[PDB]
């Protein structure tokens, strides 16, 4: 072959924290079909938004929006339990089909995105240069979003563990932990990675009795 | 400058499932220092092994081993709660210092790796060609390790939720769930991504009452 139809830019979705998560890497030959399974960020979340992105930046807001759609009818569950399969399918014609399926309900929604959508040539080239100009800023954002999500995990898992602990947790421990949880909830609102790590650390330092209780319960 | 000291290959650690997780990307100018926070895979895990890797492959076994060391004295806790900070620090001399610190205990261990360690020039070039020859095989492995870890999450979270559910969970539901959990535990032993997804799906399909109970408890 003298030509190869390839994707000029990565294609993916926005995940928690406003980061692009790639489903089809830049320079993939089409036709192609990839899937990954995602979950909910909150207890009892009833719907997710699938926001389809084109580009090479880590920040979702810095990539091109191809469209978005909602999947609802997610059944009441703890965060992280539902399995929402997202598939990106680019056919022989260069049409992208994105679907999200809830593996519990079997409910599914799709967006179809015409071959002509997204960034034109000049934007594509600016994009490839921008990811490269900003590799460091993007790395730092990726590490911040990671820390923030780990903090959110710790926040929510700890609160759950205090509730299952009940009386097993001493008064002093529970005061220390809940002060720390408030401070971490606040730091999760900022963009200061060290501050989040500082509150996580404080929570790790005050929660040792709680962790023992939680481990012993199961 | 007419020269720039840069890393010829990525440096990282082996994480759960035998995948390399990069701490310092290929082509990073030194001196440099990056950190990320990791956790434990098991309830009550008392130690982790930090296995330092050089190379561009997704499979840890396909990269060059720079050394390994253990961090223990991790206090009894549920999987995913401990915060083990791993830092890669390459100084002006090209020496890599790797340390792991438990943020709860403050316990820390390090390995120091001389500038001369790891792959020589010819292996470096073979490595860069191999990651490229095997981009697809590596992608598939990465997606398998991801699915496997999500399945492991589901397995362990579900078992915890059955225990906290107790009598709240109907007899029929609990039979269906525990059959599914056994089947998923078995599939997690294989390398068949679809089979794991099939058992996860079955668990999602039988657990809807359990998820309602779990959400209501918190």
């Amino acid at each position: 072959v003298l030509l190869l139809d390839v994707t000029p830019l990565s294609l993916g979705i926005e995940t928690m924290g406003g980061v692009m998560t790639t489903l089809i890497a830049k320079n993939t030959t089409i036709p192609t079909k990839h899937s990954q399974v995602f979950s909910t960020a909150e207890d009892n979340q009833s719907a997710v938004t699938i926001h389809v992105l084109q580009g090479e930046r880590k920040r979702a807001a810095d990539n091109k929006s191809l469209g978005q759609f909602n999947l609802d009818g997610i059944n009441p569950a703890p965060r992280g339990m539902p399995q929402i399969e997202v598939t990106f399918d680019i056919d022989a014609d260069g049409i992208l089909h994105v679907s999200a399926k809830d593996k519990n309900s079997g409910k599914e929604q799709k967006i179809t995105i015409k071959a002509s959508s997204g960034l034109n040539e000049d934007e594509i080239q600016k994009m490839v240069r921008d990811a490269e100009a900003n590799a460091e800023a993007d790395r730092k954002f990726e590490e911040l979003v990671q820390t923030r999500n780990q903090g959110d995990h710790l926040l929510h898992s700890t609160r759950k563990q205090v509730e299952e602990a009940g009386d097993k947790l001493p008064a002093d421990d529970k005061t220390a932990i809940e002060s720390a949880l408030t401070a971490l909830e606040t730091a999760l609102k900022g963009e200061d990675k060290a501050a989040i790590e500082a509150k996580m650390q404080e929570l790790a330092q005050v929660s040792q009795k709680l962790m023992e209780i939680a481990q012993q319960q199961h | 400058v007419l020269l720039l000291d840069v890393t010829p290959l990525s440096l990282g650690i082996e994480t759960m499932g035998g995948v390399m997780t990069t701490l310092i990307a290929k082509n990073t100018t030194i001196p440099t220092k990056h950190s990320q926070v990791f956790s434990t895979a098991e309830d009550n895990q008392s130690a982790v092994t930090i296995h330092v890797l050089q190379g561009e492959r997704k499979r840890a076994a396909d990269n060059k081993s720079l050394g390994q060391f253990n961090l223990d004295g991790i206090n009894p806790a549920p999987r995913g709660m401990p915060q083990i900070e791993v830092t890669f620090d390459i100084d002006a001399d090209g020496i890599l210092h790797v340390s792991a610190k438990d943020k709860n205990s403050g316990k820390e261990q390090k390995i120091t790796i001389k500038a001369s360690s790891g792959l020589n020039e010819d292996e470096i070039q073979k490595m860069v060609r191999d990651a490229e020859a095997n981009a697809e095989a590596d992608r598939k492995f990465e997606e398998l390790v991801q699915t496997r870890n999500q399945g492991d999450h589901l397995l362990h979270s579900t078992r915890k939720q059955v225990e906290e559910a107790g009598d709240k969970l109907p007899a029929d539901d609990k039979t269906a769930i525990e059959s599914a959990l056994t089947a998923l535990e078995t599939a997690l032993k294989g390398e068949d991504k679809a089979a794991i997804e099939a058992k996860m799906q079955e668990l999602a399909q039988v657990s809807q009452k359990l998820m309602e109970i779990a959400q209501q408890q918190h």
Binding site: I13, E14, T15, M16, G18, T21, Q36, V37, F38, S39, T40, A41, E42, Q45, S46, A47, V48, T49, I50, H51, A60, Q68, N70, D72, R79, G80, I84, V86, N149 | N149, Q150, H153
Partner: peptide, 8 residues
């Protein structure tokens, strides 16, 4: 719309 999905 609603929250974006989380990677597990």
């Amino acid at each position: 719309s609603h929250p974006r999905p989380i990677r597990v």
